[model samples]
Structure formats: C-alpha cells, structure tokens
Target: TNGTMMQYFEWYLPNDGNHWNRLNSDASNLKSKGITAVWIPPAWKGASQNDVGYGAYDLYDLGEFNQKGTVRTKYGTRSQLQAAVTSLKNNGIQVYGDVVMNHKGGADATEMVRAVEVNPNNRNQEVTGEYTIEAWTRFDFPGRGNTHSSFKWRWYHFDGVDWDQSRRLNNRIYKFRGHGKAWDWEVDTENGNYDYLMYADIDMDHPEVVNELRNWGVWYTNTLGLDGFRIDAVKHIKYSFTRDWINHVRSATGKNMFAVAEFWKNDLGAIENYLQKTNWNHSVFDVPLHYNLYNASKSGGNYDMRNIFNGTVVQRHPSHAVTFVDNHDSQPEEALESFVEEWFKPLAYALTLTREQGYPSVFYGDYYGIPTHGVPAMRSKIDPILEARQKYAYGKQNDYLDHHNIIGWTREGNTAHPNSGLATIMSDGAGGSKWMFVGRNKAGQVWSDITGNRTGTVTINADGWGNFSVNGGSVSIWVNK
Candidate 1:
C-alpha cells in the first residue's frame, strides 16, 4: 500500500473557531493531492477551552459535552468534526484519531492521598517517606456528569502526578498510597523510569483502567468509524500492553487499521528494544531519522549525505518505521524543537517521499504554509514530491549511497504502472552525477529531471546505466520521458 498520511496541525493554528469546517472543506482537495490519511489532533475535551486537547478532562467529551468552558473545542463542535470525518472518508482518505492516554489533568476535585515521593531525577528510586498531600487525582468530570460511562477516576487508577493542588510544585514522582505500586518497567530510561510524564500518569497495571481503555477503544473506533489510532506517549505506557490493546482493536474491527505510536527517542537501541518489547505490533515515528535530517540540514554541505539512513530504525526495520521530515514537536519553540533548516526542505522531502523504505507522513504546517505564524509554506516544493510518490516511486529499487556528500537511488518501472521507473539524486556539497542503473526494460528510454533542478536529460544505454545529474544542495527525480 503506497499510503501517505498528513499530521494536520502545528503548535500554532489561528484558533479561528472554524478549523473543523475548513478541514471538511479541504478533505477532497487533500485527497486529490494524493494524501491517503490525515492524523487529526486530539479531539477530546481538554481542561479548558484554551486547552489543545492535551489537558484532557474527559475522554467522552469529543467537543460534544459543554464541560470545557465552551461547547466547541479549538477545532469545532462534535457535529463539525463528524462532518469532517465523513468528508475525508468520502474522499478515500483514512482518519487516524489522536489518542492521548498517558495522563489526565484539570481534575474537578482534590483528594488527600498518602504517597512516597521518588526522585524526579530517577523516578525508580524513592525519596520522601510516606506523606499526605493535596492531589488533583479526583476527576468528577462535573461538566460531563457521567454521560458516557460512569468510570469515575480516582488516585488508584493512576500511578503518579507531578503537582499537588496547593500550588506545591513536585519534582518527585509520587506513588499513590493505597495503590502504592512501583513505576512501570520497560519504559523510556530518561528519568530512570520515565513512566511519569506530566499530569497524573495512568497506571497500565490497573485492570480496571486497562479495561476501560479497551472499552473506550471499541466505542471510539466503532463510533467514529476510525481507520486507526495514533497513540500518544507509548514509551511511558506499558509496552507489552500496547500490543495487547492494538491487537484487540484490530481483531474486533477486522480491519488492519494503520496504528502508529509516538516513541520519541533518538537512541536506536532503545527504539529497537521498545519494538521488541511490543512485538512490533505498531509502527513508530522514525525519530533517529528525523534527527539525522535535522543534523544534516544544520551541517549545510559538509555532512555526510551517505549516513542519512545510518542507525535509523526505518533502514533496519522498515515495516515498523514511519518516516517524516519535521513534525509539530520539531517546530520552532517546541520542546523537541530542531527545525530542519528551510534550505534542506526539498532534499528532506524527496528523501522521505521518493523512497520505498518507510511510510511517509506529510506535516500540515509544511503543506498549508503556517505563514499565519511565520512558518514558511513548503507546499510549492513538497507537492511535486508527493505527486512523484504517487506515480514514479515504484517497483524494484537500487541504491548508490556510496559517497560522502552525494548519494542516489533508482527504481525499475513496474508492469502495473507504465513509466514508473525513477532515479532520485541529491547532493549536499556540490552538483554532480552518479551512474545509477535502472533496469534492462528501461534501457533505451530517455529520462528528464522531474524536480526541474537540472536543465539537461539523460539517455540510458543498452546496459541501463546512466549518469544522473542533480543540482548542488538540491534533489531531482529522474523519470522516463
């Protein structure tokens, strides 16, 4: 399946009160441009109207319940979101809903629970002795008032919280009193046991919590007619449980929905370990690959373009790698901010879209031009790459990543797709040529640079080898004329 997904949000959108309607209107256009899926933001009701769905107050409130300050979320009302979903599905674009289950915030009530504080630096070690603190662990969901399911959340349902209601900031990880369980194992080793991320971290070990999530998955998937889920903070959640949860949804739906998770770590071994722990039930964002692109861009022309895919999970295990150039996290000012310099946009886009290695996801900010906030719109350069992916990026592939500053690849035309063979070349240092081979079937064909970065064309010999030309610090897709 030659599918491409778009993450349709940046840190900054206009908050114009009509994002849902606009998305609905743009669904057909996005589909026409060869986007197979769209990963909408977390649609649940956040703590307040200003919340971007991360400070989740209620899982049931998908802009439907009037709990969060206003009836509509930052996007729009439930009716509008549903309409957008319908529009996207009608246009043959799959809808992947964002699922943020790591933590819950903005509690309606406060509970005094006994807890032992663990070192915030190393959550696996205990710091303070058993003590009482005003915790925002009680979620009455007074706004929702038990409309969806009366699964009231208590301190026992969660593993930890980062703050106490009395304005006392806590740097220590607190394990709740009665539910005094240790931090989850096999988690990101950032803070030793990274199971505790902001807000009140959910305890995957709790059966009721796990059961409720499963039930929510069934309901949410069936109700929204969801094609798949984009799980948030999978590193903090129980890795093994993620597999069980994913399998449950897939088996019940009878559709192999494209499930992916945010395993935000650049360490190759850590990523590989997490995948092994989860049995690779879902794909992960190729974080190392993103870093490579970021660093390569930052290095200007001196970086080794040959190592672009080195140590990348996608290069090692492609089926479980979701490749992208930049995402919301990497945008300017975000915590994971490492904006791949603008000059490298074309090359990075070509690397992701024109390759057969990993599933590529286009960022909305890149396509629609976040010019509303100053982020340049890259649609002019990236649109052609997507178009090429839809047409010429097919069949048997060959690589020429043998040089330091220049590298290339070629694909033999597939029988099902006429004129599908393509040779892709990019140079970080200077303009050059690589004698790449396509296939004997394409031997006598004349090829032109579809990227239009070069002025000339190449005619393949009887042996199917030709010196493909590309502009310096640029990329070109050579396809049979």
Candidate 2:
C-alpha cells in the first residue's frame, strides 16, 4: 500500500483513559493527512495497568479483566480499544498492534528450576557453572481463567531472567538448562548470541510454546481485525522461529499481513544478513537510514548530504525498508535514545515524504506535542510537509543530493494528481540557492514557498529551471501557487 503511518506513543505518555477515544475521533483527520496506519502501543495488560505493555502480564486480558490490581489499562478498556481500531479501519487507516513476544513479566508465582549461569559477555560460555535458582516464570493467568488457551508457563520454557526471587540482580544470561532448554539458534550475532535481551527469554525451540503462539496468532488477527503487526525485539528472537511464526499466522488467517520487524541495529550489514536469514518474509525498520538523518541533523552543515543514505538498509533493499525520522526508542532519554535535533526535523520530513523510496512513517510526538515532558507541537513546521505529501509529492523524481550543505529534489506530477509536483530545497549551513527543474510542461510557472520561510516567490524559466532559495539551517518547499 502507498501510505504513511504514525507511531502514536512516547515512553512517558500521560496515563489517561482518553488515548483510544481520542484516536477514534481523530482517525478521519489523520487519514486526511495521509496517515494510512497507526502503530499503537501494546494493548495487553502488562505487569500493572501502567506497565505500558512491555512488562506483559496477561496476554488474554485486553484491559477487560480485573487483573494486575486494576481493570482498565493505561490506554483504556477492551471495548474502547476495539472501538478505536474500528474507527481507524473505517477511515481506511490500518491498525498495526505492537507485539512483544520475547519475554513475560510480573508472574503470578515463583518456581524453583535447574539453571546455569552463563557469562553476559558470551552466553555460550557458562562462567558460574550449573546450579538451581528460584525464578519468576509461573504465569498462571488466573484473572481471565483460560478464556483463550490453558497453556501455563514455567521456568523450562525460558532461557534466563534478570532477577531471582531473592531479589538479587545478576546481570548474567542464565540459561535454564532443564528439559532440553538451550539458547535459541540462528539469532543476531551479538555477544556470541543476541538471544537473551531482558526478562525471562522465551525458548523458541519448545514445540508446546510454538503451538500456543500459533493459536494465539490466529486469535490476535481474527479478534481485532488487524491489518498488520509491528513485531518488537526481533533481533533477540530466533531467526528461523520468526519466519515460521509469521508463516503460521498468515497461513491460518489467509491475509497477506504487512509486518515490520524492529531489528534495532545501525549496521546495515547486520540488517542485510537478518533479512537474508528471514528469507524476506517481512519488512524491517531502516535503522541505518535514521542514523544518516540523525547525523545530518546534528552536523551543522558539515555532514555530507551526498552520503546521507550511503550505508542504509533502504539504500540496499528499498522495497523492504520502513523509513522514519525518529521513533520511541530514539526519543530523548529513552533506552536507545538518539534524538535528531529539532532544527532538522522539517528537512528530514521533506526528504522522507516527498521522495520515492521506502514507506514513510510519522512520529506522534513530533506531529503533536509531548506535553508530559514539556515538548511542544511540531505541526506548524511539519503540517505543510504533510500537506505536500498528501496533495503533491508524486510522479518521476529528480535528486540534487550532490552538494554537502545545500541540496534539493524535484517531482514531476502525474495526470491523476494534477499540479501535484514539488521542488524541495534544504540547507544545513549558510543560506544558498539551487537551479532545479520543476517540469518542462510547467515552464514559466510561478511558485511560492509553502513553509513561509523564503521572502518572495520564484518563477520558472522557459527551460523549466528555477532558482530556489533556502535559509541557513532551514528548508523551503517550492510548490505551484
């Protein structure tokens, strides 16, 4: 689908009972702004109602049951979530739920199990040798009472955990070497094996666990009418298991699901290798491209704009790239924090939305405001860019990524989207100008800056070339008036 998406949450969003209802009312508005889908936060009840879905507690209780000390989740109740998804779907905006399958948190009970202490630096080596420890792996969802599945989790189903029942914090990757439990094979090549991320790492090799997940997959898609999914922590999961899990889900539902895996690494080679391992079953978030944009934003015009996307996943495999400017992880003070400075966000948006490359997704914190953390709204700067993407940005493309400080690009409009052409100029340093072609057919056409940054209008010459101007550390989109 030719569309855009909005990741609708930051880590520190205000825990109100209004997110779902607000989305329901604003679905049409977002759809008009070219938002084709919304990557919603995890909907399942977490360790607590305020867990933000990472510390997943009850997979069955979608804010319906009074489990984990509360009935309503941080977002809302089950009915509210369903209503929000329905509204988005009715407005032709797909709902992509965030799935965290690597681990479960805040178990109901603790069980003593055979475990071995493996070195955190290299999980394949057992540094402390074999022993027994009381782990919090008992996940008997008594709140919902087996409404979906009667599968109960114990210590044998996981590889390791961060904390023991003794409350001892051992930053070691403990592989529970009982009942044929082993670290998953064919995962990201990090620290000998990137299988163990945090919490109790689920053993993907277990047949029973696989069966339960496959059953849940059928239920997850059918229950919510989900058009797609945003798979979390894919790098920490087994390479083969992810592909198999995706196949099982798509097979049962008979829907060609649009899945995007979060393989969070800046190395393009590692990303390319994972894509090859997964056999290209689904698209991946272009982590390298984001760094390229991030570095450009902070370089103060010293960063070579020509090499903006030189070492990016989108550059290697355009079709499988889900391009973005910044995300939740990259937000300020988060775990993987790499916030692109505010000065270059508009330029980044223009680059992502106007060009013909990977699928563009927006950040809710960027468009709206992150009032919880004192971040203001970016609509005044990005709204015009969104409007250009929706109404204009189409047709054959032309690139001017030849200069280091001053760069621009142009699009020739198609017949269906009349006058839907655009010429964008951005500078990271001093104010400069460029002679770019709009369209030979639109020769002598008059254009104005939609961003309202440039002082005057520009007229295209008979040769369809116009002198486009952009201020220092700013961008201007020259569109037909």
Clashing pairs in 1: none
The digit string of per-residue lDDT tens for model 1 on 65-141 reads: 77757877888888899999999999989999988888998887888877878888888788778888778888877
lDDT of 1 at 178: 70
Runs in model 1 with CA error above 4 Å? none
Clashing residue pairs for model 2: none
TM-scores for all predictions: 0.97, 0.97
Cα RMSD of predicted structure 1 = 1.4
How much does candidate 2 score in TM-score?
A: 0.97
Give the runs in model 2 whose Cα sits over 4 Å from its true position. Answer: none
Clashes of each: 0, 0
Residue-level lDDT tens digits of model 2 in 391-433: 7788888899889888999988788887888899998888899
* C-alpha-based local distance difference test score of model 1: 0.85
Q: What is the lDDT of residue 129 in candidate 1?
A: 83
As a whole number from 0 to 100, the lDDT of residue 241 in candidate 2 is 85
Worst 10 residues of 1 by lDDT: 164-173
